[PDB]
Each structure stands twice: as C-alpha cells, then as structure tokens.
C-alpha cells in the first residue's frame, strides 16, 4: 500500500525521546487495529512530532476519531510511553506490509 509505506517511513523517521513524558493506552496489536491505534495516539497533546502520524492514521480508520472518545479501543488498563507504543506499532505495520495484508 502507498499509504502504509508512507506511514512506515514516518514512524521510522520519528523513532530512529519521542513525546517525552507522554503516556498512552497500550494496544493488543493484531490485524486491522488502525482505529484502536489512533484512539490511543490522538490523546497526545503537546507533541508536534506525532501530528503527521495522527493525520496518517485517520486515513486508515473509516470513522472520525476525536480525543476523549473511544469505540474500537475496548481495553484501557496499561499505559505506556509513546516511544514504546510507536515502536511496537511500527513492527506491527511492517508485518502487515510483509504479509501483503
């Protein structure tokens, strides 16, 4: 996918201390969870370095995602550092890309 590749490249760009101090809800990374990933990341407020990632994610989610609002993200227990979240998201997206899915 052209959108997928571009998002991979952006995540590589920004991870090679992203939003230092910012914690987000952990996700149970499995296929198609673009909505959940955005539902978590949309809640980061003072970090311009992830703004593009946020816009890019909206392209992959068929519904509007607004901060404070949840639907696709059903579990909110563990909170993790943004850097870790985005690194884990990256490996997940690379797998999708490798799979052709």
């Amino acid at each position, epitope marked *: 996918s*052209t959108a997928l590749r571009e998002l991979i490249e952006e995540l590589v760009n920004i991870t090679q201390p992203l939003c230092n101090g910012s914690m987000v809800w952990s996700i149970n990374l499995t296929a198609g969870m673009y909505c959940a990933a955005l539902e978590s990341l949309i809640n980061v407020s003072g970090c311009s370095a992830i703004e593009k990632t946020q816009r890019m994610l909206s392209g992959f989610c068929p519904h509007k995602v607004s901060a404070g609002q949840f639907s696709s993200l059903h579990v909110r227990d563990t909170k993790i550092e943004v850097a870790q979240f985005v690194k884990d998201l990256l490996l997940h997206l690379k*797998k999708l890309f*490798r799979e052709g899915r």
Partner: antibody, heavy 121, light 108 residues
C-alpha cells in the same frame, strides 16, 4: 560473514518435483528482520523472483507460479527449502537463494553462488 | 505487473568515460528501485537500493537517481571492472520484478 549456499545441481524429469535447499551462515533464521528469497535466471535470460520467507514464517510467492511453489525454513538447521511441482523444460535455469537487505522490503544484499537445475527427458 | 524497460540493450563505452543506464517502469514505483551488477558465471551483486542509496563496498563513481517511472544508474568514469550486465528491480510492489538487463561492453 553472511553466506548462503544452494544444494547441488539437479536434473528433474518433466512433470516431476524440484526440491532445493539453501544453507545459511552468519545469520539466524529466527532473528528479527532476517529473510531469504529464491531468484532464478534461465540461460541467457533475465532474473525472476520466485518466493521468499521471513524469520517469522511470513511468505510471499510469485502469483504466476503460486500453485506450484512452497517455501519453508528451519532455524535449527539454518536451512530454507523451496519446492516446485510440475517442472517443465522452460524451468531450466540457475536458481539462487539470497538474503533480503531490509527488515521489511524486498531487495537482496547477499547471494548464493547459484545452482543449475536442468529439466529434460 | 510492473514492467521494467531497460535501455539501451547494449551500451559500448571506453574506460574513462561516463556511463548512463536507463530503467523505465510501466507505472509509478515511487523511489523503490534497486540495481544489480552481474558478471559471467557469477551471482548478481547489489549496487543501489531505494533509487539512490549506494550499497556499502560499492565505489563512489556509481550513483542511482530517479523517481516515479524514470530511473538512471550512472558511472562517472568507467573502470575495467565495471563492464558487466546491469539489472534493475522494483521493490515498490508485489510481484517484485526485474528489467531485462543492459550489457555494458568495452568499446575498443
């Protein structure tokens, strides 16, 4: 040093099955980002990608040949195996295995020396 | 399926001269083109990936450039060891495809 070596040259009769093994060194087939592909080249002709497999068993096959191809790997043996059914004289070629030079994209940085497979009666 | 057309089929140049090899794709492949060099009886050798990234161990006379549908491999000043067959391969999309090669031969 990363090395790859294809199993010995083989003769296959038309309709028969080709099995090739690639033995690898200088990397592990369970290490993040490691992948191996097969690429063939008929005598005097261009390279053609066949299939590849990643460290986590994710696989891709050339769609024109998908029904004929299987790829597998075994980390303990450091081996990648390609199986190709219903061989035809047109499949006579040098078969290479090669490592992907990326953790998710498809181009090849280290190559085996190639093995000649001849399909003929 | 992305078709890659390499020009010219055979390029005849003398050592010392600048070479330009062309590779054109049937549709856009963004920047994702790899170049390989191949000598008789030998496996292909990776020279360039993602359009313009020079592989380690490849001398700096080599450069890839281009994007979209038009790509070039150039060599600033040919050395004897550079005469060989050159293949392009796109890695924008599945199925991964290669061009038919340019044979760079010594003009004498």
């Amino acid at each position: 040093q990363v090395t790859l070596k294809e199993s010995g040259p083989v003769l296959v009769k038309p309709t028969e099955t080709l099995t090739l093994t690639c033995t690898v060194s200088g990397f592990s087939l369970s290490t993040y980002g490691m992948g191996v592909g097969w690429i063939r080249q008929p005598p005097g002709k261009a390279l053609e990608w066949l299939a590849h497999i990643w460290w986590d068993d994710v696989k891709r096959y050339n769609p024109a040949l998908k029904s004929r191809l299987t790829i597998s790997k075994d980390t303990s043996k450091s081996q990648v195996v390609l199986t190709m059914t219903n061989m035809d004289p047109v499949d006579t070629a040098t078969y290479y295995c090669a490592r992907m030079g990326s953790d998710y994209d498809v181009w090849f940085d280290y190559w085996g020396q190639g093995t000649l497979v001849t399909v003929s009666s | 399926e992305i078709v890659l057309t390499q020009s010219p089929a055979t390029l005849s140049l003398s050592p010392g001269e600048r070479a330009t090899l062309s590779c054109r794709a049937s549709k856009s492949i963004s920047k994702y083109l790899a170049w390989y060099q191949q000598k008789p009886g030998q496996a292909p050798r990776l020279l360039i990936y993602s359009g313009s990234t020079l592989q380690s161990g490849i001398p700096a006379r080599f450069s890839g450039s281009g994007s979209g549908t038009d790509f070039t491999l150039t060599i600033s000043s040919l050395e004897p060891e550079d005469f060989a067959v050159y293949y392009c391969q796109q890695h924008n999309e599945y199925p991964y495809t290669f061009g038919q090669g340019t044979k760079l031969e010594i003009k004498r």
